[PDB]
Amino acid sequence: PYANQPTVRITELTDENVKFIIENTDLAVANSIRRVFIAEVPIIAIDWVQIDANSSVLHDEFIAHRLGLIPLTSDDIVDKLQYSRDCTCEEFCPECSVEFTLDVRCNEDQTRHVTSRDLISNSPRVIPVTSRQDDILIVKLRKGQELRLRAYAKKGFGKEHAKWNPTAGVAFEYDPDNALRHTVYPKPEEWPKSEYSELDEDESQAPYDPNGKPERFYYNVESCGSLRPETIVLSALSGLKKKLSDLQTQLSHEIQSD
Amino acid sequence: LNGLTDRDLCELNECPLDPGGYFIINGSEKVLIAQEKMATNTVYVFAKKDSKYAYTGEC
Amino acid sequence: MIIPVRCFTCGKIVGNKWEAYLGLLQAEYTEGDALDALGLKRYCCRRMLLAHVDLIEKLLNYAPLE
Amino acid sequence: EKERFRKAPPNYAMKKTQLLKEKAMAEDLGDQDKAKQIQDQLNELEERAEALDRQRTKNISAISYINQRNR
Amino acid sequence: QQPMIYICGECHTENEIKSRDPIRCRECGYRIMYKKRTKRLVVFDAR
Amino acid sequence: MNAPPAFESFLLFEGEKKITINKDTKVPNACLFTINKEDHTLGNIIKSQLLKDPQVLFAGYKVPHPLEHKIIIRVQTTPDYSPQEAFTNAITDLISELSLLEERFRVAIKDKQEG
Ligand SMILES: [Zn+2]
Ligand SMILES: [Zn+2]
Ligand SMILES: [Zn+2]
Numbered sequence: 001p002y003a004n005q006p007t008v009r010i011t012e013l014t015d016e017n018v019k020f021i022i023e024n025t026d027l028a029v030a031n032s033i034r035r036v037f038i039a040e041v042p043i044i045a046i047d048w049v050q051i052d053a054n055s056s057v058l059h060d061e062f063i064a065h066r067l068g069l070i071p072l073t074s075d076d077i078v079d080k081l082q083y084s085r086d087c088t089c090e091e092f093c094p095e096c097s098v099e100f101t102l103d104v105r106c107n108e109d110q111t112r113h114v115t116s117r118d119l120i121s122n123s124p125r126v127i128p129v130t131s132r133q134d135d136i137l138i139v140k141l142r143k144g145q146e147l148r149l150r151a152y153a154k155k156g157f158g159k160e161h162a163k164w165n166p167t168a169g170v171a172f173e174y175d176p177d178n179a180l181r182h183t184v185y186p187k188p189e190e191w192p193k194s195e196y197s198e199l200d201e202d203e204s205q206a207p208y209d210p211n212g213k214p215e216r217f218y219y220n221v222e223s224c225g226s227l228r229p230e231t232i233v234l235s236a237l238s239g240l241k242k243k244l245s246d247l248q249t250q251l252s253h254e255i256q257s258d
Numbered sequence: 259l260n261g262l263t264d265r266d267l268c269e270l271n272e273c274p275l276d277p278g279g280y281f282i283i284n285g286s287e288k289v290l291i292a293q294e295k296m297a298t299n300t301v302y303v304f305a306k307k308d309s310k311y312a313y314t315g316e317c
Numbered sequence: 318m319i320i321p322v323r324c325f326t327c328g329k330i331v332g333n334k335w336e337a338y339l340g341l342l343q344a345e346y347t348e349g350d351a352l353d354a355l356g357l358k359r360y361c362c363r364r365m366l367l368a369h370v371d372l373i374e375k376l377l378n379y380a381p382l383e
Numbered sequence: 384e385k386e387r388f389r390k391a392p393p394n395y396a397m398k399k400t401q402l403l404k405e406k407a408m409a410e411d412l413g414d415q416d417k418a419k420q421i422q423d424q425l426n427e428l429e430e431r432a433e434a435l436d437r438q439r440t441k442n443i444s445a446i447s448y449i450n451q452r453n454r
Numbered sequence: 455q456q457p458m459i460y461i462c463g464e465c466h467t468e469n470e471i472k473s474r475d476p477i478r479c480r481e482c483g484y485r486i487m488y489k490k491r492t493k494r495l496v497v498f499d500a501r
Numbered sequence: 502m503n504a505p506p507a508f509e510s511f512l513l514f515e516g517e518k519k520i521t522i523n524k525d526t527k528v529p530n531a532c533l534f535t536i537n538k539e540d541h542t543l544g545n546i547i548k549s550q551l552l553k554d555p556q557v558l559f560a561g562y563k564v565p566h567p568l569e570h571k572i573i574i575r576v577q578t579t580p581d582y583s584p585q586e587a588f589t590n591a592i593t594d595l596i597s598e599l600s601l602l603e604e605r606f607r608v609a610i611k612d613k614q615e616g
Binding site: 001002003004005006007008009010013020022025026027028029031032035036039040085159160161230233234237238240241243244245246247248250251252254255258 | 507508510511512518519520521522534536541542543545546548549550553554555556585588589590592593594595596597598599600601602603605606607609610613614
C-alpha cells in the first residue's frame with residue numbers, strides 16, 4: 001500500500017534533446033509527467049510590449065505577436081524571478097521581470113532584416129537564442145520605415161499560453177511491441193516496427209500477456225532552445241512535487257478545520 | 259494602366275495581380291454580369307401545348 | 318505573409334530557418350534534402366518551409382517614401 | 384515656387400512624372416519636343432530601374448533567382 | 455499649441471493644416487493626406 | 502468578446518477553496534473530494550495511487566465540464582480505514598516516489614556527462 005521504486009536510464013544526452021527511459025512506474029504518472037513537460041514548466045518570455053512608433057507594413061499587434069514567440073534562455077533566471085501576479089510592487093520591477101528594447105530604422109537603400117539580435121536586454125543572461133544558425137526574423141523594414149519599442153519579460157507556463165511552452169515535441173511511447181493489446185491492429189504485417197522494438201523482423205507483434213503492467217516508458221523531450229532538456233525535466237518534477245505538497249497542505253487544513 | 263510594367267503599378271498603389279476590368283463609380287467596384295438570351299436571326303420551332311397552336315415558329 | 322516563429326503543431330522555432338532554407342535551395346540542394354539538412358525530422362514542421370508564401374516582398378514593394 | 388527649384392523625380396511621383404511626360408510627347412506634334420520627351424522618359428525609367436536594383440539588390444533579387452532556378 | 459500636423463499622400467511630407475483651410479500639400483499640390491500616430495500609451499499584450 | 506482569460510485555469514479566486522470534503526450518504530465510508538482550478542494532471546496520478554492501495558474499494562475522478570476547471574474524486578475504503586487518511590497517504594507516497602525519481606534522474610544525468 002505504498003509507492004514504487006522507478007529507475008531511470010539516459011540513452012542519448014545532447015544540448016538539444018534527451019532520450020531517457022523510466023521503468024517500474026504507473027502509466028498515469030508517466031502521462032502526467034508528460035503533460036507537465038508540455039504545460040506546467042516555468043520559463044521567461046515576452047508578455048508586455050509597449051510600441052511607440054511602428055511604421056512597418058504589418059499590423060501594430062503583429063509585432064507583439066511575433067515578439068511573444070521568441071524564446072529566451074532562462075537556465076538560472078527562471079528559478080529566481082517571481083510571478084508578476086504575486087509581486088508586491090508597482091511597474092515591472094527587474095526583480096520580477098526583464099526589460100527589452102528594440103530601435104531599428106532602415107536608412108540605407110537595402111532592406112533591413114530585423115532579427116532577434118536587435119533585442120537589447122538589460123540583463124546579461126536573459127537574451128534570445130543567439131549565443132552559440134540564423135536569428136529569429138521579426139520583420140523586414142525598407143528605407144523610410146522604423147520600429148521603436150520596449151518590452152518586458154515575465155515568468156509563466158504553457159497552461160497560460162503557448163509562448164511558455166519550452167518543449168517542442170515530447171515523443172512519449174511505451175510497450176513498443178503490442179503485448180498488452182492496448183491497440184488492435186487489423187493487419188499487423190502492414191505496420192512498421194517501432195524504434196524501440198526488440199522483436200525480430202520475422203514476428204509482427206509480441207504474443208499476448210494477461211498478467212502484464214505497462215513499464216519502460218520512453219521519452220524524447222526536445223528543447224526549443226530556451227531551457228535545457230534535463231533542466232526541463234527537473235523543473236517539471238519540482239513543480240509537480242510542489243503542487244502535491246500544496247494539495248496535501250490544503251487537505252490537512254481542511255481536515256483540521258472540520 | 260494599359261500595358262504598364264509592374265514597377266509603375268506598385269508605385270501607383272496598385273498590384274499587377276489585379277484582374278481589372280471593373281468600373282469605378284463613386285469609389286465602388288462595379289462589374290457587369292454577362293446576361294444570356296436567345297440567339298437572334300435564328301428560327302425556333304417550339305411545340306407549346308398549353309395553347310391553341312400545335313407549333314410556333316418564333317424568330 | 319511572413320514566416321512564422323514556431324510550428325503550429327509541434328512548436329519548434331522555424332522563423333530562424335527561412336533564409337537558410339532559401340540559401341540551401343539556391344546553392345545546389347533540393348527541398349527533400351534541405352529540410353532534413355536544416356534539422357526538421359517531423360513532417361508537421363516541414364510544411365512551414367513548403368507551404369509558406371512569402372508575401373512580405375509585395376508589401377515592401379509599396380515603399381512609403383523614396 | 385517650391386516645384387520650380389525642387390527637382391521633379393523625388394520621390395514617389397516617378398510613375399506620375401513618366402505618365403505626364405508620355406502624355407506631353409503624344410500631344411506634341413513636334414519632332415524636337417517629342418525626342419526630348421522620349422529621352423527624359425527613358426532617363427526616368429533608367430533611374431527608377433537603378434533605384435529598384437539598389438533597393439532590391441538583396442532578398443528581393445535572391446528570391447527571384449531561387450524561384451527561377453526552382454521552376 | 456497643436457496645429458494638427460498631417461502627412462501628405464505621395465510626398466509623405468509633414469504639413470500643418472488648421473481648421474477652415476484647404477486640404478493640400480505645401481509643395482506640388484495633391485488632395486490626399488493621412489494623420490500621424492497618436493501620442494497615447496499604445497501598450498499591447500503579446501498574447 | 503466573452504472569451505475567459507488564461508489565469509482562471511490555475512489561479513484561485515477570492516472565496517473559492519482549493520479542496521472541499523463532502524461525505525456521501527448512499528454507502529458508508531465514502532467521500533467526494535472536489536478540487537478547484539486543476540485538470541487531469543493532479544487527479545489521474547492520485548487515482549492510480551489509490552488503486553494501488555488494497556484497502557480502497559473504489560477510486561475514480563471525473564470532470565463535470567471541460568470548460569469548468571473542477572474535478573470530483575470519489576473514494577471509498579473499508580470501514581476501518583477512513584478515506585481522508587487514504588488520500589493523505591497516497592499524496593505522501595506519491596511525493597516520495599517523485600522525489601526519488603528526481604534524485605535518480607539527476608544522478609544519472611551527472612554520471613552521463615563525461616562518464
Ligand atoms: Zn516587482
Ligand atoms: Zn511541425
Ligand atoms: Zn499639395
